[PDB]
Amino acid sequence: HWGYGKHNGPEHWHKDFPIAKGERQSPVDIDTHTAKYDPSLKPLSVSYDQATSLRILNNGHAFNVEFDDSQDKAVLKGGPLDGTYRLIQFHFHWGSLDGQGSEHTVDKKKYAAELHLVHWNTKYGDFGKAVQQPDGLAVLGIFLKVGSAKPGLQKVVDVLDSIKTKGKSADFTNFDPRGLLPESLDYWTYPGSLTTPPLLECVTWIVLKEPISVSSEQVLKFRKLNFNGEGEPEELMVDNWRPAQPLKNRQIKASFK
Ligand SMILES: O=C(O)/C=C/c1ccccc1O
Ligand SMILES: [Hg+2]
Ligand SMILES: [Zn+2]
């Protein structure tokens, strides 16, 4: 089935999932000289104080930190968004090398990694329903670069040993996502898709401008993860990003002047 390799990578996806070549695919390149400041955008509201994580899973392409979304706890609202979008999980995409890893790019620049905090619109009752809707999902995307350690990431770093291979999960309660954020909430926004199959065109992207910095030794542990499951040939989980897709005359708006 789908992967990031030569024979099952992003370039093969269109065969099972024809929407891969659709009209609002992600990720895209953010051209900063083409993005327009948008006066109408209300300020972004990221309310993660009551966030209730449950567990962390290696799903054979990335690791997901999953949250309890059966109440309006961790919620994204405001900005380009109408209503309330409940946090369901976060995950990363990263490279084999620091020069690559992110999915979105800024004026062609690839970051070392990219964080996706996935949220579903609470007027659709559940995640599965929301992804059948064009405004069903909001994703907060945050670029990673290599510099100093992100203290609020180290707890995630620490657990990776125990979820090495496809299918493993460990308990991951009381993680606080607030320590994954950069200082500023300036952002670019456009309508787009999930970046993994089934690539559904259900996403409002909010991509932060200010990257977080993580340490060389933090990203190193990310790259020690396995695509394969226990007792299979070792295939390092690296380069699990989709490249930039055609914008197709979408509009990227900036929250900042
Ligand atoms: O495997 C994934 O990429 C997501 C799995 C998932 C499961 C439950 C809820 C949301 C999800 O993204
Ligand atoms: Hg959709
Ligand atoms: Zn993602």
Swiss-Prot record:
How the cofactor is bound: the record states: Zinc. Can also use cobalt(II) with lower efficiency, but not copper(II), nickel(II) and manganese(II).
The species is: Homo sapiens (Human)
One molecular function GO term is: cyanamide hydratase activity
Question: Mutating N64H has which effect?
Answer: Enhanced proton transfer
State what changing H91Y does.
In OPTB3; partial loss of activity
User: Could you identify this protein by its name?
Assistant: Carbonic anhydrase 2
Pfam annotation, one family: Carb_anhydrase
Query: Mutating A62S has which effect?
Result: 2-fold decrease in enzyme efficiency, as determined by kcat/KM ratio, and efficiently inhibited by chlorzolamide
In what way is its activity controlled? Activated by X-ray, histamine, L-adrenaline, L- and D-phenylalanine, L- and D-histidine, L-His-OMe and beta-Ala-His (carnosine).
Summarize the impact of V118 to K/R: Strongly reduced CO(2) hydrase and p-nitrophenyl acetate esterase activities
Instruction: Write down the PROSITE patterns for this protein, in alphabetical order.
Output: ALPHA_CA_1 (PS00162), ALPHA_CA_2 (PS51144)
The Alpha-carbonic anhydrase domain sits at 1-256
Record note on what altering N59V does: Reduced activity
- Entry-annotated residues carrying Phosphoserine: S162, S169
Effect after changing E114Q: Strongly reduced activity and sulfonamide affinity
Keyword Transcription annotated: no
